[PDB]
Structures are given as C-alpha cells and as structure tokens.
Amino acid sequence: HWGYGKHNGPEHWHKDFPIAKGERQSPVDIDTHTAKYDPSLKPLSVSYDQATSLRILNNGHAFNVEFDDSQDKAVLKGGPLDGTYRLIQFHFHWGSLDGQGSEHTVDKKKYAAELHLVHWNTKYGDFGKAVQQPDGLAVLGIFLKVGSAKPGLQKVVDVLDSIKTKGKSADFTNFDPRGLLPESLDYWTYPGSLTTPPLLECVTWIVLKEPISVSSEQVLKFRKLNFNGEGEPEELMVDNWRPAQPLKNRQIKASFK
Numbered sequence: 001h002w003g004y005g006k007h008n009g010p011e012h013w014h015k016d017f018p019i020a021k022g023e024r025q026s027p028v029d030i031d032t033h034t035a036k037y038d039p040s041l042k043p044l045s046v047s048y049d050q051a052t053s054l055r056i057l058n059n060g061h062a063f064n065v066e067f068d069d070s071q072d073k074a075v076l077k078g079g080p081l082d083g084t085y086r087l088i089q090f091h092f093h094w095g096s097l098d099g100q101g102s103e104h105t106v107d108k109k110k111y112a113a114e115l116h117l118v119h120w121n122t123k124y125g126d127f128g129k130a131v132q133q134p135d136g137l138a139v140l141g142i143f144l145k146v147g148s149a150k151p152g153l154q155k156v157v158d159v160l161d162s163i164k165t166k167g168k169s170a171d172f173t174n175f176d177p178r179g180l181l182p183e184s185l186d187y188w189t190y191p192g193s194l195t196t197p198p199l200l201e202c203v204t205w206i207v208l209k210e211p212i213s214v215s216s217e218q219v220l221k222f223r224k225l226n227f228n229g230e231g232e233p234e235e236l237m238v239d240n241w242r243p244a245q246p247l248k249n250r251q252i253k254a255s256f257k
C-alpha cells in the first residue's frame with residue numbers, strides 16, 4: 001500500500017493511481033513572477049466562529065483534526081469560489097529537517113510544513129460525492145516557517161503523544177482553527193488535486209501568501225509521531241509530502257499585487 005518511503009512513495013503512486021500523471025495534479029511550484037494578479041478575485045470569506053472540532057486521528061500518513069460537517073458551521077466562501085464549502089478536517093505535511101516539508105513551493109522555496117484545511121462543496125451533499133467533481137473541494141493551504149511559536153497550534157502539539165501510532169484517535173473538542181491563520185488572507189489560486197491517493201482532480205487550491213511561524217519544538221513534536229501501528233517497528237512520521245508536479249496547462253492567479 002502507498003506511503004512516503006523509497007519503495008511506496010510518490011514515484012510509485014501512478015501504478016495504483018494512474019491519475020498521478022494527470023493534467024491537474026498538486027502540489028505545484030508557485031512562480032510568483034509568473035502568477036498574474038486578477039483584480040476580479042474576491043476576498044476570501046473564512047467563517048469559522050461556529051466550528052465544532054470532534055477528534056484527532058493518526059491515519060498512518062498524517063494526523064487529521066476532524067470537524068462536524070453535518071451542518072454549515074465552519075465554511076469557506078468567496079475568493080475564487082462560487083458556493084459554500086464546509087470544513088471537514090485539517091492536517092499537515094512536514095519534513096525531517098526544517099528546510100523541507102511543504103508540498104507547494106514558492107519560487108522553489110520549501111517551507112518546514114504546510115497546513116491543509118479541507119472543505120467540500122455543499123451542493124454535492126457529502127464529501128464522498130464531492131471528490132468525484134472538478135469543483136468538489138476547496139483546500140486552504142498555509143505555509144509554516146520555523147521561528148516563534150504559534151500559540152493556537154499548541155493544543156494540537158500537546159495531544160500528539162496520545163495518537164502516536166496509526167489508527168489511534170483522541171477527543172479533540174473545542175478547538176478553534178482561527179488560531180492557525182496568518183494576519184493576511186491574500187492568496188494564490190489554481191485548479192488541482194488531492195496530494196495523496198486517490199489523487200482526485202477535484203480541488204480548487206487556495207494558498208495563502210503569508211506563512212505562519214511555529215517554533216522548532218512544535219515541529220519537533222510532529223516528527224515524533226509514527227507511520228506504523230502500535231507493536232510494529234518504529235517508523236517516524238516525517239517527510240510526508242508530495243513534491244511539486246508539472247503545472248501543464250494551468251495558470252496560477254494572485255489576489256494581490
């Protein structure tokens with residue numbers, strides 16, 4: 001089964017998921033000089049005040065913080081989107097070293113990690129249906145650089161010991177994802193895909209210009225998680241990122257000059 005190792009990592013995925021070599025794969029390098037300002041792009045609308053977090057799960061490739069998506073509670077609208085997209089989960093990708101870990105890159109620069117807030121288009125009724133549509137998901141991507149701590153990340157860091165291995169979960173109620181956002185909501189946008197199998201081409205990517213800063217200790221704690229299950233040999237959960245994919249016939253648009 002797929003993973004991030006030399007024998008089952010991104011270079012192998014196409015054998016089980018041929019769309020890996022498709023026309024709108026993610027992530028990509030964001031060449032800032034080639035991304036054009038689009039004055040018609042609207043501001044992003046992030047409505048997270050009524051978010052209801054439920055649980056945190058180590059799924060063997062990252063950890064997901066899951067939300068109640070059975071009602072409009074935490075939603076993304078505006079920006080390049082038409083329609084309302086419900087937050088279902090967030091997760092991160094990160095490196096073994098501070099100089100790598102992000103999936104998107106900016107002028108070929110890699111950040112230490114990347115946060116993905118995954119939302120699905122309510123016109124499709126459920127997430128499983130949404131991922132089968134070209135406008136089914138909107139993923140808000142946020143870069144993490146190592147510097148000062150992010151206070152709103154600490155409750156996530158604190159619980160990781162309790163979900164060390166694959167298949168472990170813990171209660172994670174009353175978490176406010178607003179504490180993970182940078183000041184600015186300026187963004188780049190382009191059409192792409194899930195960055196993990198099944199690699200479905202269903203995502204409008206919205207990647208924020210401004211990274212958040214996290215401390216070296218915060219990301220160190222990410223790196224103590226395990227890809228393996230309890231009782232299996234220890235494999236540290238690091239370098240769970242897919243590299244940049246060919247841009248092909250796509251343009252990246254900027255909401256800002």
Ligand SMILES: CC(=O)Nc1nnc(S(N)(=O)=O)s1
Nearest residue numbers: 089116118139193194195196
């Ligand atoms: C349920 C769910 O969220 N599945 C995802 N698969 N890949 C994603 S990503 N890295 O593009 O945000 S999300």
Ligand SMILES: [Zn+2]
Nearest residue numbers: 091093116195
């Ligand atoms: Zn992701």
